């Protein structure tokens, strides 16, 4: 019986000025009385850390009973008009009973430009 860890949705969106984007990680399956650890980390798409979004990483803990965890990523605003850009948040290193990654364990985040 295997706990799976995955993002609640595979795609998130925000405007450049949204300040931060919230992402939800689900735990489903197996024995929910176990504690589960999952690492997370941003990766550039066409949007770049230090420029369009803030580099973010960490470990999330699903304590017993917990099925939903929220993580936040900083979005950087500017006043230049350009195309919409995306980046990635990968999940990894799941630790418990067996727990592992499900689908999707990468979320893609599109920042929509709000200028012009
Ligand atoms: Ca920008
Ligand atoms: Ca703007
Ligand atoms: Ca802009
Ligand atoms: Ca547009």
Swiss-Prot record:
Per UniProt, Ca(2+) 3 binds at 16, 78, 80, 82, 113, 115
Q: What is the lineage of its organism?
A: Eukaryota, Metazoa, Chordata, Craniata, Vertebrata
Role description: Mediates the exchange of one Ca(2+) ion against three to four Na(+) ions across the cell membrane, and thereby contributes to the regulation of cytoplasmic Ca(2+) levels and Ca(2+)-dependent cellular processes. Contributes to Ca(2+) transport during excitation-contraction coupling in muscle. In a first phase, voltage-gated channels mediate the rapid increase of cytoplasmic Ca(2+) levels due to release of Ca(2+) stores from the endoplasmic reticulum. SLC8A1 mediates the export of Ca(2+) from the cell during the next phase, so that cytoplasmic Ca(2+) levels rapidly return to baseline.
- Which residues participate in Ca(2+) 1 binding? 16, 52, 78, 82
For domains, the record's comment is: The cytoplasmic Calx-beta domains bind the regulatory Ca(2+). The first Calx-beta domain can bind up to four Ca(2+) ions. The second domain can bind another two Ca(2+) ions that are essential for calcium-regulated ion exchange.
Note the coiled coil stretches, chain numbering: none
Report the locations given in the UniProt record: Cell membrane; Cell membrane, Sarcolemma
Q: Which residues of the full protein are shown?
A: 402 to 533 of 970
Record's protein name? Sodium/calcium exchanger 1
According to its UniProt record, which protein family does this protein belong to? Answer: Belongs to the Ca(2+):cation antiporter (CaCA) (TC 2.A.19) family. SLC8 subfamily.
Positions binding Ca(2+) 2 in this chain are 16, 77-78, 114-115
Which part of the chain is the Calx-beta domain?
A: 1-92
Tissues in which the protein is found: Cardiac sarcolemma (at protein level).
Q: Which gene does this sequence derive from?
A: SLC8A1
Residues at which Ca(2+) 4 binds: 52, 78, 82, 85
List the source organism. Canis lupus familiaris
């Amino acid at each position: 019986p295997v706990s799976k860890i995955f993002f609640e949705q595979g795609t998130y969106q925000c405007l450049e000025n949204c300040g931060t984007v919230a992402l939800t990680i689900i735990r489903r399956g197996g024995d929910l009385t176990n504690t589960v650890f999952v690492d997370f980390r941003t990766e550039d798409g066409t949007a770049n850390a230090g420029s369009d979004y803030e580099f973010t990483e960490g470990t999330v803990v699903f304590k017993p009973g917990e099925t939903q965890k929220e993580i936040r990523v900083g979005i950087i605003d500017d006043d230049i008009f350009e195309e919409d850009k995306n980046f990635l948040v990968h999940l990894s290193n799941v630790k418990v009973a067996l727990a592992c990654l499900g689908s999707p364990s990468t979320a893609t985040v599109t920042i929509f430009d709000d200028d012009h």
